[PDB]
Ligand binder design. Sequence first.
Ligand SMILES: [Zn+2]
Lengths: 297, 132, 51, 289, 152, 148, 166, 108
Amino acid sequence: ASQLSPTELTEMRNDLFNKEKARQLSLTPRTEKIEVKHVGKTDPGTVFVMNKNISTPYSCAMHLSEWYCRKSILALVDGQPWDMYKPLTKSCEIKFLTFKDCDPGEVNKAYWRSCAMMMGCVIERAFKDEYMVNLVRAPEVPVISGAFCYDVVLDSKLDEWMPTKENLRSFTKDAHALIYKDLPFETLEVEAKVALEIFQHSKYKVDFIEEKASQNPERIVKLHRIGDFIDVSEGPLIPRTSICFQYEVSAVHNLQPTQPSLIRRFQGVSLPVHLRAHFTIWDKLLERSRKMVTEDQ
Amino acid sequence: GKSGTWWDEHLSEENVPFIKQLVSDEDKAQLASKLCPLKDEPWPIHPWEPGSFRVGLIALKLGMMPLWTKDGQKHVVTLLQVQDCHVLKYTSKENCNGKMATLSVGGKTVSRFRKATSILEFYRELGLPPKQ
Amino acid sequence: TEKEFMQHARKAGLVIPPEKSDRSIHLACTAGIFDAYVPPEGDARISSLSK
Amino acid sequence: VKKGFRAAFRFQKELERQRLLRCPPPPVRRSEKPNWDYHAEIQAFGHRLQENFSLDLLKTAFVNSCYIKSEEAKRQQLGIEKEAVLLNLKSNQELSEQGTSFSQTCLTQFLEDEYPDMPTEGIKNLVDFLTGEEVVCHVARNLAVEQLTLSEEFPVPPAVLQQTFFAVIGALLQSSGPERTALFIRDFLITQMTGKELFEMWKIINPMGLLVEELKKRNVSAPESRLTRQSGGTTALPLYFVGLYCDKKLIAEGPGETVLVAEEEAARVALRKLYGFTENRRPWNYSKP
Amino acid sequence: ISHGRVFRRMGLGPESRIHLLRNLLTGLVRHERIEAPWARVDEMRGYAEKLIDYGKLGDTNERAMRMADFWLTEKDLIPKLFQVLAPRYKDQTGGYTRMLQIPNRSLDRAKMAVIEYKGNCLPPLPLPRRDSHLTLLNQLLQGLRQDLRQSQ
Amino acid sequence: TARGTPSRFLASVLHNGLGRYVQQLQRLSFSVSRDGASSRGAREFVEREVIDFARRNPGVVIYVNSRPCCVPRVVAEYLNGAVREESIHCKSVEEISTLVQKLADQSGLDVIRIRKPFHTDNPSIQGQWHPFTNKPTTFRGLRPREVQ
Amino acid sequence: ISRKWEKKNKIVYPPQLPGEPRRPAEIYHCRRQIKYSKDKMWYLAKLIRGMSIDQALAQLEFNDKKGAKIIKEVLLEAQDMAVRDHNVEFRSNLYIAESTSGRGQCLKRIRYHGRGRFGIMEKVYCHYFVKLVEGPPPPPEPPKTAVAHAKEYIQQLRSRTIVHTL
Amino acid sequence: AAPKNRRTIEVNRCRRRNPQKLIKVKNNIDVCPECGHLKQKHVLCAYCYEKVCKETAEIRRQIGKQEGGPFKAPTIETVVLYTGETPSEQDQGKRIIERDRKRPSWFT
Ligand SMILES: [Zn+2]
């Protein structure tokens, strides 16, 4: 830990991320073939001959049809939800999950994780430079609650203020500007040592990486990026950042008595393009999302 | 290309009656909230002057009926029902044409699911059901 | 006001010379191999001079 | 059919012309076309500008290094020995060096004696423009040195064209007098300045700062900008005339659509007046002493 | 001007319209599922409702007997109407003759409907299911409902 | 017709008359026939006047091909890359001499509508007119109906 | 008769230098002598003109016109041959660049008008031409804004000279 | 009434190429959740309807085989059975039609 400008911190973080991605692309010498089967319901028996650690379930959807690319939000690699731009590794079986499936719980969780990550990206780059803004983590609140949340610790000078409606609308406008540019949710699986060396600064992120690499015997934590923002998240994410259609930030709340310092919780609600609600229903959801949600035990 | 949509397209079998019930209750509560104009903050009430004109209303044509006068004559009448008539907005004398002030008045209540979004925002700010 | 279309064409070859002819098609090659040369299974291992 | 041959020949020629128009072939060198005699072309070139070149020196000035490398590569790949003249082709490098150096010094002397109140930076940028790639390439192409040039890449890349042009200048310098070649570079390079503004060859960035430091050099206190005229300020098509006053005395004026651009134009006008490069200046005197 | 004018002009006259609807209704009673142009199916559905009501009026009712005798042209579906169809809808009041839109007729590109009496031992039609309650919007609305119940 | 044809402005090639005048004609290539009634004027032009023309102007390279042709021709090539081809088919020697002298006299620029037969690069010396020329100023620059 | 659209798939390009754009694949297909009117076919081709392959097939599947299924068949064979012959990996990564109809060879019949008079009936035929380019459909040109309108008006004002003088 | 003058190709293009005469783009089209064969909203899927119609046709052919001749219409309910699938206790009085198949996994 030393003195570093946030801009140079982002540049060095991106450089390390790209170097790791390059070495992951490079340790495989030649193009290898995988026979990924389609265990879905609409196009059964379809096998794709894809490239190892190069091609993606979005590429499989491109082979199938354009509707698959448009509607498929998650993949299922033999048991598990994969984000749409994660290169495939072994000869597997695949199934595409959309927002209107019978059991869309996995895609709901992934969509809310993505929305929380976008909200954190908007928050980190919307405050004065001489305040220290640090992201603690995004609690894995359930969709049945009113909103997704992000925990942020601000510098000591801002332990007495509260953002007003204009500032909240500014946060929503930043979120919509982020939505307007189609940014893929790039993914990466790295080792614990590399994960620590990318961040190297925030003790909150350090303990987050420790907690996320302890339960894995291989000490691997997932890493995701939109544009030049990099966050640590649990579980996969949605392919594109324009999937969200309605996006807002509702309010921010404090939880002081659990720590000498102050941790704020930003809350927000979003609805995808496939599931847009009417003006009145969206107003109802907006009004509910302003309530504090406490699901951490 | 974004497909069209209506209010109850993605709503579930159980969520449709809930949404209808909740929206109707909010509508009725908003309608009942305006029952006491003289207690909220009434605008000053001026005496009637000779060259003065007051506001009208929006009614609904119910039908026609016979009627008789004390001299035995018969006249046909038309029944006009005032369903939900409220004053919506008031423009100043100089803000429309400088000739006369204007009062906008709304008719019977309609559904919020089939109105323009700007109209919905206007009625949300006013705190009243939308008018036909 | 009395005209139709034409050019009835077929795009497949056939065996019409043997139907009736006193001359035959002169061939220059054969159908396959008289007998396949089975290579030794460990030819790569025995790629040296001799054993 | 109709009997005859004249209409058929005419239509065949028309069709050939239309095919050539629709699918034009890539352009080729003039040396690759039928009517070409290189010695006659060189002599006519020398004669047309009314100069007495040394013939061998002109050939040397028209040879290029890349041409020599291509020829030796061709001979070594064909396995044929041609080491009788390839080892003596003696490319135009030194002639180009001499020509470029003398052209720079002569243009500098000309412009310095024509505009004494010019800065060294302004004179240097004027010389850089006049010897610049685009101007010398245009002059060389219009004077037909691109035809006699020997090199690959028939386009004759602008660097190679400029090198050969200054090699011709140096060959004239070696063959004849420095005064003669000074007249040559006058006639074919100074004339390129006609109808051009100073700040179209200098390409300055901060005219106000330049004017301020010029007045500081000249012991002039400071120019204050005042709005001398305006017509329409609340419209989308405004006109402003801003004048620069030094010690309550007007030194320059400039128009613009905005006050800022009007002030910048006034500063540019002041710089032009101070440096003596105006549209009203004495035209260049093309004559003989 | 056709303000408030039900009963579209179908055949070559009112009698032709009635006979076309009668043929469609007889086919529906026989087959439990009939595909035909959309407007004719609409009129025939309106008629099939009241046919089932007349069947529920009772076997021994003379008026119902005459109505069934007119509206069924095969005379072997009248026992069906009185002892299979009417006793099938004893509990329900008016909820039968499900009607759906099928893509289009091939030749003249006519708008086509399918109509079926409910019950219908035939295989089920691909009915349009509503969105599942586990979707994101429905889960948000369910959370709103639970929060409202708690606030009550 | 001008509306049905291209146009250009009056111009020089490389500022010809500013320093030294240079002959814009580069090459003349003649196709003339040994036999053939149509190449008789060209034949006698080559016999007599081509040598004197070449001696008169040495900045022009003249080639004579002498090939069988039904239509003798002259191709004029100019310093600016312009190529012009003319037929000297069944022309007298005086006609051909006038043609070649005209070719040597012209520049390579296109013979199209000339559009305003003068080209000045400094049209104004005392300053171009603008709506504020010939307009007096007011005290403090006060526009009409002002207060201070 | 001319058949030049058929021979546009026989063009062989020289191998690209390594550092070059991808040069997306280019597939031409057509159907000749369709028993349909060329104007009626032009309307469907105009609708299909700018879409991607999947969107065009979707639009043609629910059009109740005789030529809609014909164009759908042509597009399906074009897609199959694009993937099979012209080395297009993603079957959905195709868009329609050119889609047009042309007149075919027709026939003439007698019409027998209501006297000893008559007319000549024409039995109409048409061709359909399609061209698929590998890659996503190009974005539509956005309408020009008031900023662009003002910019071009200002440039028009600035471009004007003093005419018929020096 | 006869046309006084021939209509030009420019006028004809303006008339027959304006947006009122063009085909409109429809946004009712989405994928069928079952069979994924591109149905249209508010309209049944052609693939699924054809499947159901084929099964109904086979069942009706069996009905005609069992019924004998015309004018039969049994006065009892009906139930369709498949390979195995012993009849249930509730469907006693019903007519039984079992053709020969494995029950499709959409008809229960
Ligand atoms: Zn289906």
